[PDB]
Design a protein around this ligand. Structure first.
Ligand code: HEM
Ligand code: HEM
Ligand SMILES: O=C(Cc1cccnc1)N[C@H](CS[C@H](Cc1ccccc1)C(=O)NCc1cccnc1)Cc1ccccc1
Ligand SMILES: O=C(Cc1cccnc1)N[C@H](CS[C@H](Cc1ccccc1)C(=O)NCc1cccnc1)Cc1ccccc1
Lengths: 462, 462
């Protein structure tokens, strides 16, 4: 409890921590419910303890901008230390300081709009595959589980845009390349293991010396050798792998081979469950708000008549589609929180922050803050209309973070999801079932996902 | 053994490491014998593994200067991570990066020649106490153990120059203030505990969370409350404590109370066994080289006739005394090694050094290098004569390190020891006994100290 007297000294409010545990027992109702209550009880800033680790929450847009943008390179550069990681220490999302600054520079040209526009035909091909699999489920009137049909789609886009492997994962759910990649599910930080890591972070170096890794050693080994097969088959005889292979064909020393494999794994880990989960949250709102679904289908047919195939330019042309995606990401920011480690004693916006404190931004609680959003629990896409989009603070609505360490795959993720929604809504309408959980209840765990899997009815428009 | 392929990749020679242990089994004959053999077998640079920690040894004066001086603030700023330390993390010798740079700036005015000249009368007073205790042992013809009579003297100077406590520790060897401070003996890094820390450094955070500290918790607790008693007795109603108390009466935030206590402990830990051990090494050489002892006694009587009390200016006037002290420190550089942690990938003097490597300078092996010293094992004080002192490279002879992180108490240590030798040689002559180990054999452990305690005969000149 020697690390529990810091917030009381600084005059910062917060829940009283227990010895060893800190405030982790308050996670019984999830990260989201704990952050909303703390914002309600304590005001604009407060503190708590993940075990012995002090966490300072901030909700001021100016102070958020200083952390994420202004003093990013100088003070708030890294996230909370994470382990055990093994060779995945070289992943950009885990790297720190100049290593991260180097990796971010080596991978930024990979995520330009020019490279993204060249990936659209590959992503659009599996929009068609998604339709033929949805139509087989629609011609047989059976509730469809969205996470399975979208999870199959997200897996398809990943395998093709990152390695050129072309699989119908829904009809080959057991191909060895699909088996390993489907094990890359995002971490439940409230599960028994990660809560124990919070109480015994001194055990992280012990797990590392035993080569134990939060990424399953069999999946990383499979992709490590699979990449080294592809690397020596293209060399010599458009995806993310080739962009990184061309990058290491050189300031910063070219991407290493092991460094390159770590980024490929991170791109799969980042885009698999996220793209599948968001697309399920979107179709839930469209099915429970049919007027929104019709207005979107009308816009899609206006830009793409006769079910015209979507393109890069016609996707950005659609504004109500962007309004629906943004509004869904408001109600369900799957990151929930943003974090930065304060690397040195600083004073920002008139507040002292000691070295070692984890500065946290509660994105979920701010996305539902009535002091910034009217009727925050309601699905209202008109908040993001070209008229009202000016009245939204970019440091309150942060579904992809902000600053130099925001989501590097933001453009890709938005284009990937919008291409799916266009092709799906051009051919189908989605209606609730009896077994559809209405209203949707969120999981009380550490992942932003529905309590029950979203099941809906799918009807063909032809 | 994943950290044992680094030196073979870089093309750097060195002994082949065993799994888990690295090269620690080669410490069976001590740090000194291992460094001399490695310098002999492998040449100017080599590498080895303290467990999994790579250690790169360098012996080039230009490359040594780049590490200790040139790229000190930018690359080689900290020493090897050390634990478990508890609150002694705030000690200057343990602090890192800007914390060390701040502490070094707060404590540098404490070690100026002006402050040292004001401490001479306090140090000289216990030169007289040292004589009355040596004379009681000399009037009774019994071999004197130097580490006990000098250890009592060194303890006397410490208690007075750091807190103003005035004790005859040889006749009060059981005063509570002497009991705790005599437990501050320097660490034997080849003892069972510190070798286990080398093999299981992942256990250091475990020892920290249990409040286990390499500094005995009872000694630190005794001095913590003892200092807070003295701090609130002088406040309000010349030593190291007062200099630091006046310093916190303020750029860098003033020394904290706990920070202040950590420095006081570090000054005791630094000056206790060191001053006692060096003074024993010096008197061993004087007793086995009587011509040197007579020449020194003649110089002392020439500057201070009629056993005149030594002063700050008359100590610096003595050149043969400085030659004897420097020559003894050459044969016995009690630090043995100098170390710096390479904090970022750099290329110095045409050699690449990866981040995380411990760069080591083998001071003991260089002090006895025949390629810089003629007859290196012989005690020849004339190497440091004002004629030959120009031919000695300050990066080969480094008894106090070099650069911004050299020994901050160098001036104090030299003045403290010289004041003792002047008062002792003005009144006594030291001759070998039958039980005097000649030639002196060094301890095969991790501390530079004689195998057997140095015992000598002491005769009065009056
Ligand atoms: C709906 C989908 C996604 C959402 C909502 C999302 C959101 C986020 C958020 C909130 C962060 C943290 C930002 C911060 O800490 O300030 C992040 C980081 C990151 N995201 Fe995503 N992401 C998505 C998909 C993707 C995809 C498809 C990729 C593909 C490469 C990706 C790659 C990354 C990387 C590499 C980082 C770490 C960046 C760094 O540390 O420099 N994400 N994302
Ligand atoms: C014969 C006596 C002594 C010898 C041979 C000696 C030698 C050394 C050496 C070799 C270093 C390391 C330098 C480096 O890493 O480059 C050091 C560091 C240090 N010494 Fe001593 N020392 C002696 C006595 C003292 C005394 C009396 C003090 C009293 C304050 C002291 C305080 C320190 C401190 C604080 C450091 C660490 C400096 C830093 O990290 O910034 N030493 N000493
Ligand atoms: O960088 C990302 C990757 C990502 C994932 C999905 C979509 N895009 C990007 N994720 C960030 C935080 S990185 C790290 C998690 C991690 C570990 C290993 C490899 C990759 C990432 C973390 O949580 N560190 C701090 C921490 C917190 C709590 C407990 N321990 C440590 C946040 C995020 C999460 C989900 C979706 C989006 C963003
Ligand atoms: O700073 C000093 C202090 C000192 C002592 C005596 C005289 N003056 C100064 N000592 C340096 C190295 S500091 C640290 C040891 C330490 C630990 C706690 C508190 C103080 C010091 C270390 O060894 N770190 C690296 C390391 C190496 C091996 C294994 N683990 C870690 C060296 C030295 C030693 C003896 C005499 C002089 C100098």
């Amino acid at each position: 409890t020697h690390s529990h007297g810091l917030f009381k000294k600084l005059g910062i409010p917060g829940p009283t921590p227990l010895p060893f545990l800190g405030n982790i027992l308050s996670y019984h109702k999830g990260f989201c419910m704990f952050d909303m209550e703390c914002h309600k009880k304590y005001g604009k800033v407060w503190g708590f303890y993940d075990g012995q680790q002090p966490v300072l929450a901030i909700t001021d847009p100016d102070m958020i901008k200083t952390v994420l943008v202004k003093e990013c390179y100088s003070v708030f550069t890294n996230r909370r230390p994470f382990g055990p990681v093994g060779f995945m220490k070289s992943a950009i999302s885990i790297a720190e300081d100049e290593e991260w600054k180097r990796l971010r520079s080596l991978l930024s040209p990979t995520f330009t709009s020019g490279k993204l526009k060249e990936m659209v035909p590959i992503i659009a091909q599996y929009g068609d595959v998604l339709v033929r699999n949805l139509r087989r489920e629609a011609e047989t009137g059976k509730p469809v589980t969205l996470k399975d049909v979208f999870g199959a789609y997200s897996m398809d886009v990943i395998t093709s845009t990152s390695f050129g492997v072309n699989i119908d994962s829904l009809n080959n759910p057991q191909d060895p390349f699909v088996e390993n990649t489907k094990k890359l599910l995002r971490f439940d930080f409230l599960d028994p293991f990660f809560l124990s890591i919070t109480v015994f972070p001194f055990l992280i170096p012990i797990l590392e010396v035993l080569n134990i890794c939060v990424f399953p050693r069999e999946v990383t080994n499979f992709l490590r050798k699979s990449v080294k097969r592809m690397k020596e088959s293209r060399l010599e005889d458009v995806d993310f792998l080739q962009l990184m292979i061309d990058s290491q064909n050189s300031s910063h020393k070219a991407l290493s081979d092991l460094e390159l494999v770590a980024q490929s794994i991170i791109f799969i880990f980042a885009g698999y469950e996220t793209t599948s989960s968001v697309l399920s949250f979107i179709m839930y709102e469209l099915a429970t708000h049919p007027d929104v679904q019709q207005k979107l289908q009308e816009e899609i047919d206006a830009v793409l008549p006769n079910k015209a195939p979507p393109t890069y330019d016609t996707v950005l042309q659609m504004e109500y589609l962007d309004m629906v995606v943004n509004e869904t990401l408001r109600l369900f920011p799957i990151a929930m929180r943003l974090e930065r480690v304060c690397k040195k004693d600083v004073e920002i916006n008139g507040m002292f922050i000691p070295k070692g404190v984890v500065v946290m931004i509660p994105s979920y609680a701010l996305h539902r803050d009535p002091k910034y959003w009217t009727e925050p629990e309601k699905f209202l896409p008109e908040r993001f209309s070209k008229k009202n989009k000016d009245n939204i603070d970019p440091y309150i609505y942060t579904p992809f973070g902000s600053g130099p360490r925001n989501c590097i795959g933001m453009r890709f993720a938005l284009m990937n999801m919008k291409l799916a929604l266009i092709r799906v809504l051009q051919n189908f309408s989605f209606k609730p079932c009896k077994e559809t959980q209405i209203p949707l209840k969120l999981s009380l765990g550490g992942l932003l996902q529905p309590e029950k899997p979203v099941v809906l009815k799918v009807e063909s428009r032809d």
